[PDB]
Curated annotation (Swiss-Prot), chain B:
Function: Self-assembles to form an icosahedral capsid with a T=16 symmetry, about 200 nm in diameter, and consisting of 150 hexons and 12 pentons (total of 162 capsomers). Hexons form the edges and faces of the capsid and are each composed of six MCP molecules. In contrast, one penton is found at each of the 12 vertices. Eleven of the pentons are MCP pentamers, while the last vertex is occupied by the portal complex.
Family assignment from sequence similarity: Belongs to the herpesviridae major capsid protein family.
Domain of life according to the entry: Viruses
Complex and partners: Homomultimer. Makes the hexons and eleven out of twelve pentons. Interacts with triplex proteins 1/TRX1 and 2/TRX2; adjacent capsomers are linked together in groups of three by triplexes, heterotrimeric complexes composed of one molecule of TRX1 and two molecules of TRX2. Interacts with scaffold protein; this interaction allows efficient MCP transport to the host nucleus. Interacts with capsid vertex component 2/CVC2. Interacts with the small capsomere-interacting protein/SCP.
Protein name in the entry: Major capsid protein
Residues of the full protein shown: 199 to 247 of 1381
Localisation per UniProt entry: Virion; Host nucleus
Length: 49, 49, 77, 49
């Protein structure tokens, strides 16, 4: 709900939204990945394709 | 290609590698043969290959 | 152990850098059909009978050794 | 005044001697831009680019 520029800054500065993990079979949920590079656009707009 | 094997070898990555083996075997085989069919691709295709 | 500490500041106010996804290198997740079960999600709940519950669990709900497509996508309903 | 203060802003940055550097450059519109890839060092160290 917060300001736009705050959303955009947090978008790259931080992870979040509890994204699923990579290179695993069952698609676990991750909290502290070692070196993972996640970028989720569907979270910000709340839309599915 | 180092981008595929940056995470070591795991089941998901091995499966991606074998799928790409199948694709690339079916597509880019006997390259100079299709080099005649492509037409204007004459030199840039073979040079790139 | 050798240590080394650095400092950084952004000078201008407005944004000074932009990334862009340019080329799709690979598709990790397979887009196929893999329903996420609930009986591994909700193990505590159960029906009234043990007979009906066992029958239900055996008919439908029931580590994969090998996978040809990749990291399977959980489909939720 | 900006001209009177420019030596104060560059605290010895113009003083340091310059050396030629190897990098690809392109002309976009009016801006000259340097374009490069650092993947050699990360491929040498088996770390994710």
């Amino acid at each position: 709900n917060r300001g736009l520029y705050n959303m955009v800054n947090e978008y790259s500065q931080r992870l979040g939204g509890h994204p699923a993990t990579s290179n695993t079979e069952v698609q676990f949920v991750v909290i502290a990945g070692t070196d993972v590079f996640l970028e989720q656009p569907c979270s910000f707009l709340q839309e599915a394709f | 290609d180092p981008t595929f094997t940056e995470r070591g070898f795991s089941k998901t990555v091995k499966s991606d590698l074998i799928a790409m083996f199948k694709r690339h075997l079916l597509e880019h085989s006997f390259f100079l043969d299709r080099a005649e069919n492509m037409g204007s691709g004459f030199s840039q295709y073979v040079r790139s290959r | 152990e050798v240590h080394h500490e650095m400092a950084s500041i952004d000078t201008g106010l407005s944004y000074s850098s932009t990334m862009t996804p340019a080329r799709v290198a690979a598709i990790t997740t397979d887009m196929g059909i893999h329903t996420q079960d609930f009986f591994s999600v909700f193990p505590a709940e159960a029906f009234g009978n043990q007979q009906v519950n066992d029958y239900i669990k055996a008919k439908v709900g029931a580590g994969a050794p090998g996978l040809c497509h990749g990291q399977q996508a959980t489909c939720e309903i | 005044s900006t001209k009177s203060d420019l030596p104060a802003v560059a605290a010895g940055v113009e003083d340091q001697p310059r050396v030629p550097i190897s990098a690809a450059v392109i002309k976009l519109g009016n801006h000259a831009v340097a374009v490069e890839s650092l993947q050699k060092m990360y491929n040498d160290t088996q770390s994710p680019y």
